[PDB]
Amino acid sequence: AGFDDDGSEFHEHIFLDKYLQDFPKQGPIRHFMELVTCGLSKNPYLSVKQKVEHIEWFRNYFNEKRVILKESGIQLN
Amino acid sequence: VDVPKDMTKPEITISDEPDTLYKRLSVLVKGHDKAVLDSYEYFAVLAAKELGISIKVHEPPRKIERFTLLKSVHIFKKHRVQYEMRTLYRCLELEHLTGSTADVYLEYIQRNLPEGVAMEVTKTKLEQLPEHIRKPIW
Amino acid sequence: LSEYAVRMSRLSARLFGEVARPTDSKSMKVVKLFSEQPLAKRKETYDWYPNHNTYFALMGTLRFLGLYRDEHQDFRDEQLRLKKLRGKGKPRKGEGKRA
Amino acid sequence: KNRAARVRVSKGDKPVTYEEAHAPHYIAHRKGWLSLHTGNLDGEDHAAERTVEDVFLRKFMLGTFPGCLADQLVLKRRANQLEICALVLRQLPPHKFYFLVGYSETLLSHFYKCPVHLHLQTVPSKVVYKYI
Amino acid sequence: EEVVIPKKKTWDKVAILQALASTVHRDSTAAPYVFQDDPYLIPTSSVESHSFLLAKKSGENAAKFIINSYPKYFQKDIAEPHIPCLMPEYFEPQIEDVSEAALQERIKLXXXXXXXXXXXXXXXXXXXXXXXXXXX
Amino acid sequence: SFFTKLTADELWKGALAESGAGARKGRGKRTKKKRRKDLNRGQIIGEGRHGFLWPGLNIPLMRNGAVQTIAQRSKEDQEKVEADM
Amino acid sequence: RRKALPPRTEKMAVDQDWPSVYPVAAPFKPSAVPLPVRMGYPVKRGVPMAKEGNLELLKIPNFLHLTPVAIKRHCEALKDFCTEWPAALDSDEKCEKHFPIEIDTADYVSAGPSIRNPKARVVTLRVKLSSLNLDDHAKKKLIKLVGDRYCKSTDVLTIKTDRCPLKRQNYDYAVYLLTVLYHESWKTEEWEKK
Amino acid sequence: YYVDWKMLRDVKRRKMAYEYADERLRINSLRKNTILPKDLQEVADEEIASLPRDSCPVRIRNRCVMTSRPRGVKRRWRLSRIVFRHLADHGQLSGVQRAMW
RNA sequence: GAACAAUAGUAAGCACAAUCAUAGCACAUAAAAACGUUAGGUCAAGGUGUAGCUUAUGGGUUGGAAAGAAAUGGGCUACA
């Protein structure tokens, strides 16, 4: 009572694959981000917006550090 | 002699949405002392028999939590003080209830719940089948 | 272990939302990090100490207003008054050492 | 010798109340607890949150009713609303008693974000159980 | 065909509480509920009852005055539902420099109402027919 | 720091040290004086440092037939009251 | 000017209704209770302390507002809000045939300003596989797909959901899980042929 | 004021840990994984080292609420073993009694 | 300040006892054990009387608080 979680549903929490479209599909970035998504989906302590902000933080961190991923030997975007 | 007139004016309406059915309602009342639990059990049985619920009541086993602390302030470990916390449980088993009957019984139970006890409510909601499992082929 | 069994296990994790592709226990730590709330964010941790400043300020303001009466503070004030009357008070800041 | 919550025996003239006349080993045997809540049960939580509020209430009421308080408070916690039962000597006029109870029933409620009830029982003097 | 599913009944949050209240009528030998039941605090005469009610209200408003004067001591919220009626109130405008925001803040909170309009008219600010109606 | 405070009875009991271990057999009697002063002798409940006048404690509840609001004493009147105290 | 008023005991009627005096929970004020009750450990020559100034009586909760007459009077007025249980579901044998799905939901109450109980997010869904339309191959695939959540002896599948913060979201996720398990138990893929 | 300067500093440590809870949680993911190359993990080590010292939850010490005692404090009541006894013996805590068996 | 085939002893009360807890008794265990002795331990759980600090005996950051020539108390592993 008194907590609606912004009127969200189970699909806004469990299914977060729609936020991983701006990532290399066949690279280790997907391997790490699927683990992150699985961890976030099983987290009742956070709302959808905080998970979206975490995904955005990972996105901008990866898009900012471009020299290290190219130097590592694996082609990433 | 001075009894007020027209003292009843409730707002009760019946909606077309089918009422929810419950198979079993389990009420686990945890407390510290047994006299309060026995009085509450008698009160709950008397309230349920008026509404016709046929409540089943049994007593779950107690739980005792004991811990040990130092008896003195600075240095005395050979002498200790042991504290005990008792938790006694009462189980109220209600069967064959509806959504409104369970709601009103829970209202009349929680509105008069004592201060030294807590209550855990477990509802077994009855449902036939969802829409996508009745008779689909992919 | 068979090829049918490993495929069934892989499908079970995908359907349940668990980790589908094989991962190491060392890599499941990052899964658990987002699965469980961090300790620094837990209420039992970040809300451990109540606001003693708020409690003290409220009690002192009520004592000054005339609603609460703090016997400990009254005893401290009486003892300080008696000490100052005797002649051993609190030296002014900056003159204790040199002067 | 045990000295916790134990009042020492004088020559035989000290008035002692029932709560003081019993040692802490008689709790739940001859005397009950001064406070009741759910945080001290088995599968419940938020014990320290209620404990700090209980201590603050004890100190605040002791300072609010100076010298007219007979015994310690009885703090009941029943469904989000907390009741404070007190035994007060009839030293203050009823006009001042009502002012204090009205001030408290609002200040405590606004400070703890929960409804508070305050009940006072006026006694002619401190009730003595053992020798006096 | 054999299954019988009855309909549900929807009632207000206080409907059942009013139904329970209707069962118990006013007592004969009992003092009014607002007054304390202890005989030393039970009113004896009508003037005493009125004085006790006024003293209780003066205590309540005295406490509310302290709550409003010191809002920072009540900013901490403990209840999950976050009841707003127990929160401290503020009597100060949010914006001071902007006349259009100062007028709407000072109309609802008498003496400062004329000063807000005087300050707004000092800078030759055009006031519409909506802010002026509330100021009047 | 409010929770670190205690009762005046316990404060005086520890300050006077009436039940000290050295005073039992007779090692004391050197500073043969033991005076305890009650701080709540002339303490009126409603009065405080700020000099607020509350309708229920300091001033009467009703004046001139009208209800009384919360008042505050003037600076010099408060100084006179403090001088009397 | 001290005033001492006699309590309500001298004015209590012999046949006065008790719920009128004690409608709700009360701190057991001695002035409103005409019953002389002595609570406390007696003395060698003394007697247990009377109801006046007795802290032990105020310590214990009082059920004076829940006397049987008041219980009957309150429950009589509550018959208008309750609904009738259908007689067609008296025995669980027909209940299993009509509503095979059982939904266990946990609700908790606790004294204090807080209502949020983290144990309330768990939702259990119990379904008997004997009441569904799975074929032999679909049942054999579903048993291995669910694993230990299906009891072989009881033939009951249990789905325990706690991932969603809200109970409604957990219930929606559980019904979605049941739907997707039923749909995937029928699809025969390429790797099932080996 | 607070009970002690140690408790005052611990309050600041807890506030800083709560402030930096998200940043440290995000950074530790890059360090506790094996999928990502160690080249970025080494830089993430410097990134998490550049954080303020009091930001980590490790510096948080569980003291007593009443007396700020660094040890002998039960986690359930957040009180020292001595204040807890002083309150239980007075009977201000429900369900607490001397163990007799 | 006592003689039971009784010679100045009554005695509130605190102790002991009884009672309570280890969910049936008994037993046992647990608990309790007064007034006082050891100026016994604790200003470092916490507050404190007196005597002392206030650009310091106060408040913040970093780094270190080893090591065993040797003696000994209590436990674990064994010497089959």
Ligand SMILES: [Mg+2]
């Ligand atoms: Mg200090």
Ligand SMILES: [Mg+2]
């Ligand atoms: Mg630490």
Ligand SMILES: [Mg+2]
């Ligand atoms: Mg004697």
Ligand SMILES: [Mg+2]
């Ligand atoms: Mg026994």
Ligand SMILES: [Mg+2]
């Ligand atoms: Mg025995």
Ligand SMILES: [Mg+2]
């Ligand atoms: Mg012993």
Ligand SMILES: [Mg+2]
């Ligand atoms: Mg004994």
Ligand SMILES: [Mg+2]
């Ligand atoms: Mg010595």
Ligand SMILES: [Mg+2]
């Ligand atoms: Mg020694």
Ligand SMILES: [Mg+2]
């Ligand atoms: Mg000191």
Ligand SMILES: [Mg+2]
């Ligand atoms: Mg020292």
Ligand SMILES: [Mg+2]
């Ligand atoms: Mg340092």
Ligand SMILES: [Mg+2]
């Ligand atoms: Mg050695």
Ligand SMILES: [Mg+2]
């Ligand atoms: Mg050995």
Ligand SMILES: [Mg+2]
């Ligand atoms: Mg070996």
